[PDB]
Symmetry: C2
Subunit: 248 residues, 2 copies
């Protein structure tokens, strides 16, 4: 009877090259069917973010579905989440066209810095451990080399009594995305804070020279391309402060 | 026996004004029991985003739970989302504290412009049925007036053959999420697009904007960064597709 698309959308990182897409025939199927497709551009275009492709889908007697990898074009550049479209057409004389014969394909980037934070905003532990590896997690990207100031604080707890006054800076290299602050430390429960400061790209990140040279230009005089470069750079997140509770 | 927050986690629209926080008694409810708490600063602050409260709850023998209100400060300025913190203390001897004895609280800024985008990347439309109400959403915010360019594109469906003209711009006033684009029809398909959202030369923060937009990004302080972000944008879908 008809012949369509299943699944409907495809969400895919820019960094996996080959990726499959799945076509479907329906109703009766005893005969040799067929249909064709074309990779139409969106905010992703053949040549820049995916390599445009056209082809022919043959559904011999018996088979009722077809597959085919499409390719995504990797790069070191920071962009945003774009779409390109694939479109069905020319179904042979038996088979008609049903929903959906146009497929939406999102390309998630990964060349962003980007966002830095803690797991929870309160952590527990006794007081006979006696070091706690607090994790600062890197999300949404790993691109570049980034510093991550950090420091502790007293609350129900005081340095050199409940814990050890700890201060420093975490250095997230390129493709790394989790670092651990090292934290050294009958009833009695107290707690101290611990913050992560303003993430900053480091001089060696292969994009750092470029960035502080644009910040020369007034907001006003920024291209789209230039505008986005500035959207790439790293930042904290919802959890820039944590708490560490110490019972016994 | 023990006391804690429940929920130990709260989310809030900065425009709500207030909301209730909740504590709880576990062991022996047959006795009177007290407890304190005090708001303490996080990403937020007790004069730009809400009000400060250290206070006193009473758990008369019989009640095993308590509730109180915290007030959110509303404003015009777009900020990012900000977890602030409430924490209990000074329990009555009988009782001990427990998790979550630190309620974390987030403030959801309502002051973005905000983010526009079609509802779907493909819309289906039946044979002989006239007009369709296409929607442009405005997620994340709706702070001030935003102008929204649209139009139409010849495809397999041709303008003035399958569909037609349709080209203008939508003016989302202040507190408005959605506005429609209008499409006029008579196997194939055409796509519709939205453009590059722009504020209006009157939206209270606009001189204030193109003023700072004069600065070298460099000398752009910190609140200039955040102010800046608040300007309207497009979400995921900026092309629709109409199937006939
Ligand atoms: Ca692109
Ligand atoms: Ca891309
Ligand atoms: Ca990449
Ligand atoms: Ca990219
Ligand atoms: Ca604030
Ligand atoms: Ca606020
Ligand atoms: Ca507000
Ligand atoms: Ca606000």
């Amino acid at each position: 009877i008809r012949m369509y698309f299943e699944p409907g959308h495809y969400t895919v990182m820019e960094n996996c090259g080959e990726f499959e897409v799945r076509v479907v025939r329906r109703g009766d199927i005893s005969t040799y069917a067929s249909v064709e497709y074309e990779t139409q551009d969106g905010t992703a275009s053949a040549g820049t973010d995916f390599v445009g492709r056209k082809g022919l889908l043959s559904f011999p007697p018996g088979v009722d579905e077809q597959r085919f990898r499409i390719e995504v074009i990797d790069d070191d550049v920071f962009e945003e989440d774009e779409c390109f479209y694939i479109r069905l057409f020319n179904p042979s004389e038996g088979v008609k066209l049903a929903v959906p014969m146009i497929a939406t394909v999102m390309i998630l980037d990964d060349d962003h810095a980007g966002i830095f934070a803690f797991t929870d905003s309160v952590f527990e532990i006794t007081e006979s451990v006696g070091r706690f590896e607090l994790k600062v997690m890197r999300y949404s990207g790993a691109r570049g080399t980034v510093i991550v100031p950090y420091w502790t604080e007293n609350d129900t707890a005081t340095e050199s009594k409940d814990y050890e006054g700890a201060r420093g800076e975490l250095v997230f290299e390129n493709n790394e995305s989790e670092k651990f602050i090292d934290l050294f430390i009958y009833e009695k429960d107290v707690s101290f804070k611990v913050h992560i400061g303003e993430p900053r790209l480091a001089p060696d990140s292969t994009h750092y020279p470029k960035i502080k040279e644009v910040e020369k230009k007034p907001v006003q005089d920024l291209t789209e391309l230039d505008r986005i470069l500035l959207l790439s750079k790293p930042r904290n997140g919802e959890l820039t402060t944590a708490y560490v509770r110490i019972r016994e």
